[PDB]
């Protein structure tokens, strides 16, 4: 059954699958798209980072007035690059090919993960796992400023076989050229060998041939049970225990994320990338285009889940071995079946679906935000969105300097209780003490008790609740959540994830918590964004029960096998891979931008990247505390472009596409099940 | 005539003309801002820097640390005020651009010129003794996409556009040589508050087509008929402050710190009249979109007000309604015959005014406020707005379209700290203060000149030796060349032509941060500072202690007898000074900079700070605040005005990689000029 692994060559060569592993397609290694000044990344370990047809601009931009614009602004694409020497001038048409990494997508017989030693040692695979390749721990990237992204440390995409200081190239979309720029920065996990635990990082500048001995090593491992894994966090100084019917792989320290070059990139707390075997206030170094790397020389941060230990009365930063009292511990566990989280949005703890068993219960944790670096958020189907201890301040901030503290702008967001009758009523402002756990949505983490436990999410893009495919089991129905804009950070749910299908609607489904153990509901200026229906656009915002005709409905279904989207990048519907069968066809939906810092995007292998109805404005903006929703000219949708008339490295030609011609310029897709 | 300059934009293809006896200095094209390396650097539409003599879709060059500059090689943008021409269906190129670029003129005026805003449908009268030059609509902010954009100073004539347009600017893709209008472009205009009580909830509205004009605040641009320099003064209390001696009251109002629209905070300098609004409201503006619809208080935007010492309610719930009166600081706007400056001691000593200057008030050195994911609002350190009479850990309160205000945890303040002489070039000592804050806050004095009007000039040596004043100029102080502070990941700059960029005492951390619960923190987090650097050689690794001084540019602040501007040739030729002006120095046209993270900033093109005497591809250094070490990084970019000598105006820029050995020959030149 179709567990899918993606391999990147970091060269002009197309990589190969192993024997036994069936090749699904080959392509070009896509890192991220910069659309309307918003960076939307693909996971390098996922099939969505392997794009069959190259273009410097494989996307189309669509606005609120039935006009789409191709290659009409200043959007960029970023691709993993090769070992070719850095050119003096930007490269154009077929010379580009020498600089774009190639990739292959393969079906593996069992789960595949990356493990990281955080040292010069190559880490071993866990018992019952075997190595596929070894490499270097690739953590984050920025092209310029804080525009960039980062990898999940559980993902094979965080383990690149070739260490390169500049591992990606930047393409000017409409100019059709690609180049390297001095601001391009890579961030790699650092070799912590023999470092003094909890003491100040020993700053280093490293050059040329000595760089590699300072990079953390990794191995990508496949299970020989299909070997699904997850993390569990104690939120205390005590190491937690793996739940019944799961086996301990390793213990560690709870990594929430990293803030490099003023961009926070989180590690999902359900994944093994949130459980580091070695704690440090600075887990990574930066590497520049002149083959110099700097460790703890400038001003970057790490974020760790914390304990309930109080700040000292002096409120001075914590340093030295005192830090041990403040950092949460974790374990990584292996299970024969998949793990999910369910959120009630009520005081009721949700029950596990029929056929599943409860691993733990907790509180619905949505995101943490920071000042002027964005934030770090959880997938609402991940166990990381279900923390067993409610905390106003669940995350502590640490610096290259070697100290950590709670700083005032650190905020947390949790799903709130929404009584059924209150869904379409204006949120009522409330300030609460952080021991009032009765205002916080409850959650349950479940493993499947043979079906491995795959969930499919479908969005109707209408007022009608959609049905599961025949033979699939309906688990719940809900409303199509796209993202929450909280303290001016946009945290998305992928539309293929059950986390985008929330059972209860509200213009404000979250509350925020801050310092002094105080939480606030509907007390500031937050907003939420939902996939919308086919209803006519209103002349002014809609309010309370009128909102219901503009919110897409959804259903979450349990399916016997894996599901992916495939994209033709042409006007034709793509066939499913050999051995897979189609569930629905649609239009290739990549990313979106909106007012302020608003934006997000879909994984290209996710069913969320395949919407059945093409809509230039597929989502609506809800004013959180006002209880009203509306469409705005600041909303943009990005779809994969129909490249049928283009050569791979041909420069995009500007096109303004009007009315009924828009759909003919949009890539088609099919959602397929093994 | 001392060389006071007024800038007018026609919002049309026709070049505008100067008033009666006003002498024309030059004409040009109306530059709004430049988006370089994903950083927006704006020109003040009321200043000569917004009037650029030679158009290009990309009039700038990008230079890096590794011996290469790039022209038209990335995805940089320019934004220009536009005309009344109909919006095209697709981007326009080459000569088709011309009909869409507003023209401008720079004129010499005999006296000070300001904008006054009614915040109503009524055109405000000029203050007694002032004469109107034009009337218009109150233009506050703009965004092109996301939170990239900027805003006007409400004292500036640039906040008073004669023609109201929902889309008053056009966007040019630098390297493609095309310009266009995009659906995400938004303008923000001050709102007509005629039918509303000040502390009642904003009554949200959606306004269509023909009714939009009647909801826009009106303004008049006024010239003094004394030259009538003005300043604001804030009480930080509900009491209306008094105008100091030898100054006269123009109006009283409420202390506006800034606005946060589409997730971009744009401050009003607290020394300028734009920080003193006649009418308070939690939502002073509306947004207007490209489809001729405006929305007032329908979505989620903010205003920022200087606050009183009134305690938050113990419940910590937001404040609403009549209760808001207790929290909003009051202000006055005063006129004076001479100019106003602030001096900062960086110590517990209160500084004395220079010889020939008289003290108006004393206070504490206020640098900036930061907010979460919208940036921050900062003060010019020579402005009286950088000298607040009362220290406050939380000097600013945040207000919403909803009609409520509160302090929120992410709202932080930054103050200049005490730096002893012996603390310079030493690693900062961490300190968390729960009491005795004033032991670590710099003191300041606001002075007016006692005839010379008190014009101050700043020179940067780009060396470790202090530069000299031009003869006839009086030296007031010397210092170190501060470019910007990166605090809570907001970059707040000092213009290199402002005396605020000349800091008497160096530290890798010259500020401390204060926040909720009345706690201040020095060297406690991860802040950093950027200084103009020297001619010294690039180090192989970060420098420390006795090595840092050779890398920090020195500066001098001098009093000049007449006004001083930079002029730019936009060619390899050194430009002549205007008729009746004489040159002080020559140099290279320095527009903006970007660095790690959210780091960046830029110079006003009429400021001497836009004219550096030495070209350096990496003209500044990055100091790690708490570590006390400084270094150069590949993330540092400098932007210079480009040599357009052989470019036709609407010609498409040609990509060029420019290697060391010819970088200087592609850089516009400048001369800094003083009125005779
Ligand atoms: Cl584009
Ligand atoms: Cl809110
Ligand atoms: Cl460019
Ligand atoms: Cl610091
Ligand atoms: Mg906001
Ligand atoms: Mg930072």
Author numbering:
A (entry chain A): 4 to 227, 1003 to 1227, 2002 to 2226
B (entry chain D): 3 to 227, 1003 to 1227, 2002 to 2227
Copy out sentences from the published article reporting this entry, exactly as the authors wrote them.
Collagen IV is an essential structural protein in all metazoans. It provides a scaffold for the assembly of basement membranes, a specialized form of extracellular matrix, which anchors and signals cells and provides microscale tensile strength. Scaffolds are composed of α-chains that coassemble into triple-helical protomers of distinct chain compositions, which in turn oligomerize into supramolecular scaffolds. We solved the crystal structure of the NC1 hexamer, determined the chain composition of protomers, and found that Drosophila adapted an evolutionarily unique mechanism of scaffold assembly that requires divalent cations.
To overcome this problem, we recombinantly produced FLAG-tagged single-chain NC1 trimers with specific hetero-compositions CVC and VCV using the same design as in transgenic analysis but without a fluorescent protein. Thus, the CVC composition of NC1 was able to spontaneously form a hexamer although this process was highly inefficient. Moreover, once assembled the CVC hexamer was not dependent on chloride pressure, thus confirming the Cl- independent mechanism of stability. We were able to obtain diffracting crystals of tissue-extracted NC1 hexamer (at 2.98 Å resolution) and CVC trimer (at 1.75 Å resolution) and solved their atomic structures. We solved the crystal structures of tissue-extracted and recombinant NC1 hexamers and found that the tissue-extracted complex is indeed a heterotrimer of the same composition as the recombinant CVC single-chain construct. RMSD of superimposed recombinant and tissue-extracted structures of Drosophila NC1 hexamer is 0.43 Å between 1346 pruned atom pairs (across all 1351 pairs: 0.47 Å). Analogously to human crystal structures of α112 and α345 NC1 hexamers, we found multiple PEG molecules associated on the surface and in the inner cavity of the Drosophila NC1 hexamer. Instead, two magnesium ions were found at the trimer–trimer interface. Single D40(1590) of Cg25c directly forms a salt bridge with Mg2+, while K79(1629) of the same Cg25c chain and D79(1589) of the Vkg chain interact with water molecules clustered around the divalent cation. Collectively, unlike in mammals Drosophila NC1 hexamer interface is stabilized by four Cl- and two Mg2+ ions.
